[PDB]
């Protein structure tokens, strides 16, 4: 994939850097936080993305939407 982007760099003017992200895929979570929230049941799939548990709002709907949520 890097070599794919390195070639793409030739089609652009200016300087571009290829950077390996610290985050899991396109999520805003670092690769260890995402694993922790996955094993804590706080993250569910939504197709090509995910949805994260909120400690806010209606309690009942929150519980139904995230069944595997190990509360602390």
């Amino acid at each position: 994939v890097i070599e794919g982007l390195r070639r793409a760099r030739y089609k652009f003017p200016g300087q571009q850097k290829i950077i390996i992200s610290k985050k899991w895929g396109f999520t805003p979570l670092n690769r260890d936080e995402y694993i922790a929230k996955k094993t804590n049941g706080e993250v569910i799939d939504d197709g090509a993305y995910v949805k994260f548990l909120s400690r806010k709002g209606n309690l009942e709907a929150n519980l139904q939407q995230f069944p595997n949520y190990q509360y602390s």
Binding site: I19, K22, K23
Partner: protein, 159 residues
């Protein structure tokens, strides 16, 4: 085609505040203005009568005339190399008392109150305000506060 009408460029200045449209609270119509009062000018868009020109939006002046629903305010405007006194007629919806008076009027009474007491106690007191002076010496004790050593952090990319 230049356009320089009366209310040109007042798209945002004469707008009502967000979630503050509609009727005017009546404390505006209950305040009493006397000749010689210091008032602030802020045009209210919902009242198109007695509206100041955009120049006077945000200016402070002296009330010199009081009429049925308005006050006459005096503003000094720079026109070239001198000031000109302008006499603006404003409905009281566009006018508010200037709060700069009250703080100074409080100091006038406060100063007199302190001064007369010093005469009573046979002492003297200095009434002039003082700018914040440099701070004096002090001793910093370190029980529970042993200094933490901080160092600059290494560069790291956070995307």
């Amino acid at each position: 085609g230049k356009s320089r009408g009366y209310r040109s460029g007042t798209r945002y200045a004469f707008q009502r505040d967000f979630k503050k449209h509609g009727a005017i609270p009546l404390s505006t119509y209950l305040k009493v203005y006397k000749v010689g009062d210091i008032v602030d000018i802020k045009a209210n868009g919902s009242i198109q009568k007695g509206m100041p020109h955009k120049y006077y939006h945000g200016k402070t002046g002296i009330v010199y005339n009081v009429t049925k629903s308005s006050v006459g305010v005096i503003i000094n405007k720079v026109v070239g190399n001198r000031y000109i006194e302008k006499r603006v007629n404003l409905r009281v919806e566009h006018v508010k008392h200037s709060a700069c008076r009250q703080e100074f009027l409080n100091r006038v009474k406060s100063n007199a109150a302190k001064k007369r007491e010093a005469k009573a106690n046979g002492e003297t007191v200095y009434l002039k305000r003082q700018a914040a002076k440099p701070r004096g010496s002090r001793i910093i004790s370190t029980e529970g506060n042993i200094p933490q050593t901080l160092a600059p952090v290494a560069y790291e990319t956070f995307i």
